RNA sequence: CAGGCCUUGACAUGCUAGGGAACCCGGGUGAAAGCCUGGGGUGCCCCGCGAGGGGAGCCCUAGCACAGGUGCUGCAUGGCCGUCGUCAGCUCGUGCCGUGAGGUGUUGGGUUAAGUCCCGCAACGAGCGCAACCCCCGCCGUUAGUUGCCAGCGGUUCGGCCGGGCACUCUAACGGGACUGCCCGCGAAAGCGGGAGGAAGGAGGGGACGACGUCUGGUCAGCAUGGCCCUUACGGCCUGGGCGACACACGUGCUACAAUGCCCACUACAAAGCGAUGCCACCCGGCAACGGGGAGCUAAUCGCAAAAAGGUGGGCCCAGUUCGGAUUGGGGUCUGCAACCCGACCCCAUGAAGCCGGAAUCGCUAGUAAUCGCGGAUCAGCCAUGCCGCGGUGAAUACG
């Protein structure tokens, strides 16, 4: 039960509660960041590539 | 519990059948999946079969069990004890 | 630690008497980093001992300290197949730490209901040579003398 | 303390308000 | 007629204005003792001038913001001691030896991942 | 008390009880067995019996391996004993001088 | 006559805060020099590995740096000339009054 | 399993982002999605060309995609045939004014993503992986690089036991921030499974 | 998991044939899904004053390929991570020694946080690590002066509010600064001990950073991927249940057992963040949760916001209590289609265990521990006492 689920997550639901974010990249339902539309893993994968504008390794 | 400003919630599809049976005179058994529906004064004396996930449990409604939810009378877990 | 002999923290002299030893005592009173509370308790105690016995609190406090200092202690050392309680002299740094520690602990075993009072009275007894604090010191010393025979195992 | 709702401290810990901690 | 110093401790910053007079001291719109009422830590703030006897010789106008009362107190201690070195250059000796003229860099160490706090580690049961 | 984990395997109360009677051999040494934990597991080669037990004089960690789950358990016990006997007697070695 | 500058890169921000402040200082009269508005930092903290290993993270941040410049004595010499200026890509400009 | 990604570690020091723009909270995600879809299409279509980097720029309703490549011609076409074909496929997806540029990769044998893909191609052709890796590194050093390191992990040669083979020459100081190191990855799909290829090229320190 | 349903199928690329495309709107049956069905107008380039004739814009219906599988194998794998370990190490080239595995270098004397550096040496170099280059913090400077600041002079509705100014604070970009550089001493040197200057001293504090490799470590359930397995079902939709069960057992935490405390009332002092079906001033109804009004703020402007410990006063008087706040009864609020299973919050009542914890065992070397509160991601709401951050207060001790 995966591709059917990345699909069902797209279609608007019968009630607005049933909506939930999936990672637009890998389809992950968990740890999905609103700001990027990405999960924690993809967030890390693209950022390391430099394909997230302004995003950089944070050190203090 | 549910805000008093809002309604006394019954799923309408359950309720409708109640009033239908009330008019003609009650009663046939009513199979419902509506655990979330309040027992309502109009329902008293009926016997509603409440699906617990597996079986439909026959529940004869009485004057004492009005304010409650339908699910409260069709328990969802089989537990006979330990050991 | 393994590499070097650590550095003794130099404390800041206390506001009311200008005393590093008082500051140290305050910190030992201090629970949960509530030093304002800690400060009051001591200074409140300093008030009390003046009322009960009109002298210099500072003089009392310092006399109580010199009375709780263990001059000799036992430290275990397992030699062969037995643990011997070896008699050792206490370094002045350590004498201080133990004295201030026992003072507060013995204070807080006392029955009267307010800390400042317990701290007051214990400092009064220890100054005169009574109280559980001095009892600790006396005992530690007696243990050491009791094992004078093992004083050659000293490192 | 912090576990008692009917007190000020309890409402702070819990991050709510009421009679025992008003705003 | 005016003399100035900048004090910082932790997150507290203090602007202090030394102006000669009888010794009245003001912190953020209130007397010293009104703002630091009930704090033993307080009178440590006036320590730099006690080192050069400027106890009663100066009034002091003082701003303070950020951090907490104690850090603010330590901040004041710094600034008024900068103000003094400013009021007289030869004040350095008999101020530097008391280290009043230096700023301690000791601040809150950052919280690290894997730990409960900065250094406090989570409890583990090996077996 | 004593915990047993059967990783990605099903076992019976019988088998669990067997392990308890087998660990029981360690009671020989009259020392406290604190939270003994047995983990049973299946590799492609055979079974694996893991155990971690703490005692007043140290920890016991051992892994037993064998095609027969019972032998795997028995070898686990053998390795645990040898460790426990060292923990209980190593201190006696240097009583002189 | 307000110009508000916002970018993810501060080299290309200060770049453009400079040039706007130059352009209108040329065709006069007064530019209120580029004031650096405090940065809004958006942090993202992630577990390094895809599965378990909770105690290991990596920190990422996204910094929106703000600049403000005020052209005080405008004179539409500036206003028209400003309409064409070579602005880098990582910067967004806002003009208001 | 340890080493930090050598590019993400150098962002804004020796290496610059590939999507350079600003966007606010309400917008960022949607631009980013479109950005990746642009890369999705182009990564498939421009592979044969020798795709190394794909820079992306944005202002307002208009976007400029700069494609770096070893074979500019394979991108552009005959007088602009494919280059035109692209804008249409592009701005259909974009739905906005999509400027497509192309730019030379002066030395493809100093471009780490290129070296990586070449070796990945070589090992899908059932070439001798170790002989290949030494070659790749030999090419990169001849082309003047200050150091090189290439790594291949997986069922090498078809073997059931996965293994990792690498080779290196000169300097590759992955710990040095100011050292410019191009990095690239290439996936080699075979009948027996996936091999991973990593290429490190040390162009020099800044 | 149970039950009700769907069969090129929730989704890709196809090729073919019927319908009209396309999109919206209702009706029946039903828990819903689904099944049933009654609505209504398709541009094009086209013979079109004419029926009529498409093409492919997209759908529909029937096919066939195919889809789909969080089914198996992390012991076939890529990727990424954990660990030993921020440990000081792991090697290569050539030469030399050995029949050979292999040695040498890399050992040795000194030194360092360090295979750090020095001296010596059949070794002479080189690489990956170490360090440095990067970020935060500490001092200072330059450039800037609003939405931030207010030293001084004017107004001052009595509030940096106004004039004004950018000094100061700050904010945020760029620089300076520490190198054992300088003196004493020991040294063959490298260094070590002490001093001064200085905001800072011997890596200034913290961060990012993790060698060759190990654990046939972890993940086929984030993703990818070989192969094996499912195909009116091991795919797909829905309603309900379950993941929240409870004789027991262990791990991590929260709150505690009280007077250095608890309660009330009044009164101070942060930082980092977050906020247009959002953050909510202020007003009014309610004991309250909250509700209804309603201004401001694309936010250094406005808002969350009150920080808490603390301070000042008053009560409690050593009791299972004015400690503790579990359990349960009753009444409400809010979110949400819906709080029975299974939400958080408020109020009334109830007011348990617990009097400091056996064997055993964890953390921490300084702004640390301890203690105090604040924010954020996720997020309709929340089971967060979790996690990642932030500042407040602020120790003890290290012989070895
Ligand atoms: Mg299924
Ligand atoms: Mg999948
Ligand atoms: Mg949701
Ligand atoms: Mg989600
Ligand atoms: Mg004590
Ligand atoms: Mg005692
Ligand atoms: Mg006596
Ligand atoms: Mg209470
Ligand atoms: Mg006072
Ligand atoms: Mg803290
Ligand atoms: Mg653990
Ligand atoms: Mg068990
Ligand atoms: Mg199981
Ligand atoms: Mg079992
Ligand atoms: Mg094992
Ligand atoms: Mg035996
Ligand atoms: Mg042995
Ligand atoms: Mg944890
Ligand atoms: Mg593995
Ligand atoms: Mg792997
Ligand atoms: Mg496994
Ligand atoms: Mg030989
Ligand atoms: Mg030979
Ligand atoms: Mg050799
Ligand atoms: Mg050799
Ligand atoms: Mg070696
Ligand atoms: Mg060797
Ligand atoms: Mg040596
Ligand atoms: Mg080291
Ligand atoms: Mg070296
Ligand atoms: Mg040598
Ligand atoms: Mg700062
Ligand atoms: Mg200036
Ligand atoms: Mg030194
Ligand atoms: Mg390093
Ligand atoms: Mg395994
Ligand atoms: Mg998979
Ligand atoms: Mg697979
Ligand atoms: Mg085959
Ligand atoms: Mg369901
Ligand atoms: Mg459920
Ligand atoms: Mg669960
Ligand atoms: Mg049991
Ligand atoms: Mg227990
Ligand atoms: Mg907890
Ligand atoms: Mg516990
Ligand atoms: Mg009691
Ligand atoms: Mg009771
Ligand atoms: Mg009891
Ligand atoms: Mg009570
Ligand atoms: Mg109730
Ligand atoms: Mg519920
Ligand atoms: Mg205890
Ligand atoms: Mg306690
Ligand atoms: Mg014990
Ligand atoms: Mg340490
Ligand atoms: Mg407390
Ligand atoms: Mg919080
Ligand atoms: Mg939030
Ligand atoms: Mg939330
Ligand atoms: Mg609950
Ligand atoms: Zn993802």
From Swiss-Prot, chain A:
SUPFAM superfamilies: Glucocorticoid receptor-like (DNA-binding domain). Required for the assembly of 30S particles and may also be responsible for determining the conformation of the 16S rRNA at the A site. Binds 16S rRNA in center of the 30S subunit head. It comes from the Bacteria. InterPro entries: Ribosomal_uS14, Ribosomal_uS14_bact, Ribosomal_uS14_CS, Ribosomal_uS14_sf. It comes from Thermus thermophilus (strain ATCC 27634 / DSM 579 / HB8). GO terms for cellular component: cytoplasm; small ribosomal subunit. One of its GO terms (molecular function) is structural constituent of ribosome. Transmembrane segments: none annotated. Zn(2+) binds at residues 23, 26, 39, 42. This is Small ribosomal subunit protein uS14. One of its GO terms (biological process) is translation. Binds 1 zinc ion per subunit. Coiled coil: none annotated. Keywords: Metal-binding, Ribonucleoprotein, Ribosomal protein, RNA-binding, rRNA-binding, Zinc. NCBIfam families: PRK08061.1.
Swiss-Prot record, chain B:
GO terms for molecular function: rRNA binding; structural constituent of ribosome. InterPro entries: Ribosomal_uS19 (IPR002222), Ribosomal_uS19_bac-type (IPR005732), Ribosomal_uS19_CS (IPR020934), Ribosomal_uS19_SF (IPR023575). The keyword Lipid biosynthesis does not apply. GO terms for cellular component: cytoplasm; small ribosomal subunit. The keyword Metal-binding does not apply. Keywords: Ribonucleoprotein, Ribosomal protein, RNA-binding, rRNA-binding. GO terms for biological process: ribosomal small subunit assembly; translation. Belongs to the universal ribosomal protein uS19 family. HAMAP family: Ribosomal_uS19. Located at the top of the head of the 30S subunit, extending towards the 50S subunit, which it may contact in the 70S complex. Contacts several RNA helices of the 16S rRNA. Part of the 30S ribosomal subunit. Forms a loose dimer with protein S13. This is Small ribosomal subunit protein uS19. It comes from Thermus thermophilus (strain ATCC 27634 / DSM 579 / HB8). The lineage of its organism: Bacteria, Thermotogati, Deinococcota, Deinococci, Thermales.
UniProtKB/Swiss-Prot annotation, chain F:
It holds the Pfam family Ribosomal_S30AE. InterPro entries: HPF/YfiA_ribosome-assoc, RHF-like, RHF/RaiA. GO terms for molecular function: ribosomal small subunit binding; rRNA binding. One of its GO terms (cellular component) is cytosolic small ribosomal subunit. Induction: During stationary phase (at protein level). Also by cold stress, remains ribosome-associated for the 4 hours tested, then disappears when cells are warmed (at protein level). Disruption phenotype: Non-essential gene, increased formation of inactive 100S ribosomes in stationary phase, which persist longer than in wild-type. Double hpr-yfiA deletion mutants form 90S ribosomes. A quadruple yfiA-hpf-rmf-sra knockout strain is significantly outcompeted by wild-type after 4 days growth. No visible effect on viability or growth rate at 37 or 10 degrees Celsius, slight effect on bulk translation and timing of expression of some cold-shock proteins. Keywords: Acetylation, RNA-binding, rRNA-binding, Stress response, Translation regulation. The modification N6-acetyllysine is found at residue 65. The keyword Disulfide bond does not apply. CDD domains: RaiA. One of its GO terms (biological process) is negative regulation of translational elongation. Residues 22-25, 82-90 are annotated as: Interaction with 16S rRNA. Belongs to the HPF/YfiA ribosome-associated protein family. YfiA subfamily. This is Ribosome-associated inhibitor A. It comes from Escherichia coli (strain K12). The gene is raiA.
From Swiss-Prot, chain G:
One of its GO terms (cellular component) is ribonucleoprotein complex. PROSITE patterns: RIBOSOMAL_S10. GO terms for molecular function: rRNA binding; structural constituent of ribosome; tRNA binding. Transmembrane segments: none annotated. It holds the Pfam family Ribosomal_S10. Keywords: Ribonucleoprotein, Ribosomal protein, RNA-binding, rRNA-binding. One of its GO terms (biological process) is translation. Gene3D superfamilies: Ribosomal protein S10 domain. Belongs to the universal ribosomal protein uS10 family. Part of the 30S ribosomal subunit. Forms a tight complex with proteins S3 and S14. Also contacts protein S9. Involved in the binding of tRNA to the ribosomes. Part of the top of the 30S subunit head. This is Small ribosomal subunit protein uS10. It comes from Thermus thermophilus (strain ATCC 27634 / DSM 579 / HB8). The lineage of its organism: Bacteria, Thermotogati, Deinococcota, Deinococci, Thermales. The gene is rpsJ.
